[PDB]
Enzyme design. Structure first.
Site, short mmCIF file in Angstrom:
data_model
loop_
_atom_site.label_atom_id
_atom_site.label_comp_id
_atom_site.label_asym_id
_atom_site.label_seq_id
_atom_site.Cartn_x
_atom_site.Cartn_y
_atom_site.Cartn_z
N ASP B 290 -41.04 -25.34 32.20
CA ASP B 290 -42.14 -26.26 31.95
C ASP B 290 -41.76 -27.49 31.13
OD1 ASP B 290 -43.34 -23.39 32.32
OD2 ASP B 290 -44.96 -24.79 32.80
N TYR B 374 -50.66 -22.99 36.05
CA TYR B 374 -50.84 -22.67 34.65
C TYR B 374 -51.34 -23.78 33.73
#
Ligand SMILES: [Cu+2]
Ligand SMILES: [Cu+2]
Lengths: 620, 620
Positions: B290, B374
């Site tokens: 990420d 997410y």
């Protein structure tokens, strides 16, 4: 009226009346403990038989008694004479606390000890501490207490800042005699004050804090009926109160669309020990069984608005019995309020263009108890997502001693010449499980690591294993953070839409358990503290981890004995006993007044619901 | 103006101008990353040399470049041509995400795969995922992305509820070509919707929630000067922002009466990996970095009042650079507010008759980021007692797959035919320590158990041990909950009034670390994830656990390489790297929208102050 309602002043008076009429409450009798019994397992009867368990102490030395009374029928159901030398002494009485200081005040060898330190007896406070079971044969069968001295320079002085090390005195509270006075040697009595209210120590109070106002213009979202039945965001439960256990929770159920589903029948902190790691003969005996020996609920504080509980608060004033059977009301002894808990769920989806955010909330039920130097806050939280959590906030004044000139491996220095022995704060939660009913089982879940190889391996795979605990002898478990070990309590006969047993997962903090040597006295009396989790088959008389009489009683009588029955726990009426504590090595920041530290555990739904239980929460 | 101020739109424009004038930003060039450099260690100069690091990607296949620019002087300090096949590809560009779906839409073998499933291409969304380093030799040096299909029945439909299993496609985003299309077999595409906003799934929205109003009638207790300098309850710090790391904290100091004491020079989440435990060839390659590959700060959401942040909120709108060097403003991307945190300290003393209660408070600094399915919330908390805590709130939509008819050991079933692979959310915190200055050291503290015996034993004693980590090679530590293991960062040259080194203790959650086989690819690229704590000697170029270019780069280049230098860390300029994560086995309750779960760590004063730092807090 609900059979789980709080005991009223009227019922207490009735118990007094009944015991008196039966000749069980004479002028020489004192009530050491009094509390309602929970309705029997087969409560399918309209028989609102409101029963009370009572422990009667005799001030003149006669044998004490355990008495069960029925306030409904107005009769005494049973009365048995207790042999305290065998099963343990009754809990300590408030009126006995004063006695130790008063007796020692005129004891000649105590006065000589104080003169050898140039201390004026009128300024010497004595902390009345519980006496465990050690090497003193003359204490067996006798009601003994141990005292440690603390100097108080003036009426409003923190005596804890001035411990009198090297001196202890054992006292017999019934025959009013001092059995021993031990003097291992003089230690300088720390002179520095520990008055956190004195403007000379606090300095000018900061003026930088702006008020934070938390209000609910339309009242709370929860409703209280029948004095103690709560209904909040699909949650349904009854808030009880026992002088020994403190706040107790009954019939915790979740309203899963039309169907009210039970989760936990009864939840409580069945025990809490505070062992000291100091090996010196002046404190090596020190171990408080706050719940078992002092009765936490007895010392509950009256919480104040704005200070102890902030926001839209609803209080409960539990009723307790004094030593003579008169009702005593703990005003505002229980705080209840809901509070915002941040973001519950959130997602900004690129493809659908939908932005979704939901706030979480928690229902708070708490109470505070003060036992000498320590202050504990017990908090139960219920979250919108079906999560249940318990949290203990430990504060107050750390127990002090003198810090040896040569230093110590078991004592921290807090000030010049001032020390604080190493200790633990171990709690025992008793969860009477009712996951969608009483047919429950416990599974231990471990993360399993997989080796890179022939069968599906790029070395990225990992799994989980679940072993069912079938009998009591194999239900004594240890934690294992490395493998992310958790325990799932499920109902094999109640399945979710995917055809899997509904369940709830228990997440422990994994803090160290009882550190004492396995062969020590405290290890025996508090064996429950040596393991993280125990599961037992339910029994009406198996109420505490240690047993019914913890005071001066040898150990084993609790969990280790219950477990020996080796009963079947695979899909049965079961009880989960969780051990959790705080290993405290005092630091400079804890003096003179200790800021809050915490511990606890939580239970989260594990396939209980068919989908997210919070899809119906609105949007602010 | 402070050298730690947020980058402004004007500076971004200047960087664009400078790069253009130097012939570094042509029409074929794109900015993959742009962010301010922190002032050098020897910042004892008035030289407000505001520098920017830039990563320039070439759209026509030419070599990318790393460029350092000085906005102050208006010149380019350095420019080096990068060999991506050696040191890794630049972070993924937003404009590349669309390309994978567009290319596949006209690929013949992709269309054949969709026809074999009777799926209409116009309804097939493709999740553009980062490609790790595996067995494909033709990917080295090339900018490749992997796509997984999800069916979207209609514009506002949750594509995640309909994964298309058994199909993957690798795409070269620069030469715009599809290198591979893999079809392992057809799997039924889950038909059930996952629309949490659809009144048919949510049912009637509950009307039982009463509003909770949190306000500060006199404004907050904190003050913001220079755009990002915060002053709150003795705390002093600068809130920064980087597109890769997200919210960064600079110069965290505590005002200990007249003396402003530094604690942490720079604190940030240097990396966060999300490895998947599914061994199937369709997702075994899945591992999102990420921070390293997508740049968390780039995808920060704009937080809304009342929904995302409740109470008296003060926002910060960080400025970021788009792919062409134009300033882009993340409006309300950072939330800042203080909130009540219950009881701070409390004690009702019997002897002195004094009742003392104090409320705690916390300063909250947070931001949310959305990466595909997410959503992560990063929270930094500062407490009145000197405690610092970080907390990650993981929510969003769980990554889905098809649930095999025969079941699976690495996938949970969420709905009929719908599965969710097992995975972890591992974070890496980089704490640039400055405990009362830059002369720090790290001690590992273990609880030691003592045997009952001759020397002071009644079997109640227990101690604590502390080993100093002296060199980097011995600063790679594992957690140990059983022994209550913690790490103390102290300053040997700065002592408290008891003549002991001031320090701060680190309390970890002790959750399992990277579960992947030690010989796996992810284990190499994310070796930092295999240990709980690493300590390194500071270096200007040692910024990330994995290295500067995580995208398609082989591992080792980070922490394992830094550590090999074996530098002295006993009383030096040191950096603490803490690993903490969440092992997630999806449950039914996570579908269709996942309720918040959390992780984190905290640092508490350990002999830092001379006494409780909260003796001066007022009384409500
Ligand atoms: Cu303590
Ligand atoms: Cu997850």
């Amino acid at each position: 009226a609900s059979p789980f309602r709080l005991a009223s002043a009227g019922e207490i008076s009735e118990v007094q009346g009944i015991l008196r009429t039966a000749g069980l409450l004479g002028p020489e009798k004192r009530i050491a403990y009094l509390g309602v019994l929970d309705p029997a397992r087969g409560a399918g009867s309209e028989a609102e038989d409101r029963r009370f368990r009572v422990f009667i102490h005799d001030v003149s030395g006669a044998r004490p008694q355990e008495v069960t009374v029925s306030v409904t029928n107005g009769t005494v159901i049973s009365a048995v004479e207790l042999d305290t030398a065998a099963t343990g002494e009754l809990p300590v009485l408030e009126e006995e606390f004063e006695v130790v200081e008063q007796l020692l005040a005129t004891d000649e060898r105590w006065l000589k000890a104080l003169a050898a330190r140039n201390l004026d007896v009128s300024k010497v406070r004595v902390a009345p501490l519980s006496a465990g079971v050690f090497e003193y044969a003359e204490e067996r069968g006798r009601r003994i207490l141990r005292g440690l001295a603390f100097v108080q320079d003036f009426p409003e002085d923190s005596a804890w800042a001035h411990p009198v090390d090297g001196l202890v005195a054992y006292v017999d509270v019934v025959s009013k005699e001092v059995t021993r006075v031990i003097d291992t040697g003089v230690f300088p009595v720390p002179a520095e004050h520990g008055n956190y209210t004195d403007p000379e120590l606090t300095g000018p109070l900061r003026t930088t804090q702006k008020p934070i106002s938390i209000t609910q213009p339309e009242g709370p979202s929860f409703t209280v009926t029948g004095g103690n039945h709560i209904e909040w965001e699909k949650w349904s439960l009854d808030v009880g109160f026992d002088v020994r256990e403190g706040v107790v929770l009954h019939n915790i159920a979740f309203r899963d669309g039309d169907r009210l589903r039970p989760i936990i029948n009864r939840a409580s902190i069945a025990e809490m020990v505070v062992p000291y790691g100091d090996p010196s003969p002046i404190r090596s005996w020190q171990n408080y069984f706050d719940t078992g020996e002092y009765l936490v609920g007895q010392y509950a504080n009256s919480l104040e608005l704005g200070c102890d509980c902030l926001g839209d608060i609803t209080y409960l004033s539990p009723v307790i019995s004094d030593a003579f059977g008169n009702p005593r009301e703990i005003r505002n002894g229980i705080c209840m309020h809901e509070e915002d808990w941040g973001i519950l769920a959130k997602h900004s989806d690129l493809w659908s263009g939908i932005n979704y955010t939901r706030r979480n909330r928690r229902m708070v039920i708490s109470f505070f108890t003060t036992i000498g130097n320590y202050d504990y806050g017990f908090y139960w939280y219920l979250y919108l997502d079906g999560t249940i959590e318990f949290e203990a906030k430990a504060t107050g004044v750390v127990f002090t001693s003198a810090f040896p000139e040569g230093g110590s491996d078991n004592i921290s220095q807090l000030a010049p010449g001032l020390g604080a022995p190493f200790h633990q704060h171990i709690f025992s939660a008793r969860l009477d499980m009712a996951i969608d009913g009483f047919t429950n089982r416990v599974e231990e879940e471990d993360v399993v690591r997989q080796t890179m190889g022939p069968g599906n391996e790029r070395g990225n795979a990992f799994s989980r294993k679940r072993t069912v605990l079938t009998r009591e002898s194999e239900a004594v478990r240890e934690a294992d953070a490395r493998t992310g070990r958790t325990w799932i309590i499920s109902n094999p006969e109640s399945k979710n839409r995917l055809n899997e047993p509904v369940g709830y997962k228990l997440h422990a903090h994994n803090q160290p358990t009882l550190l004492a040597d396995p062969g020590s006295s405290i290890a025996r009396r508090a064996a429950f503290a040596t393991k993280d989790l125990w599961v037992t088959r339910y029994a009406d008389d198996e109420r505490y981890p240690t047993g019914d009489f913890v005071n001066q009683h040898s150990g084993g009588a609790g969990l280790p004995s219950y477990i020996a029955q080796d009963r079947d726990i695979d899909g049965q009426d079961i009880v989960v006993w969780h051990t959790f504590g705080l290993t405290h090595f005092p630091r400079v920041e804890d003096w003179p007044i200790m800021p809050v530290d915490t511990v606890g555990f939580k239970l989260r739904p594990e396939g209980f619901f068919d989908r997210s239980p919070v899809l119906d929460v609105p949007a602010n």
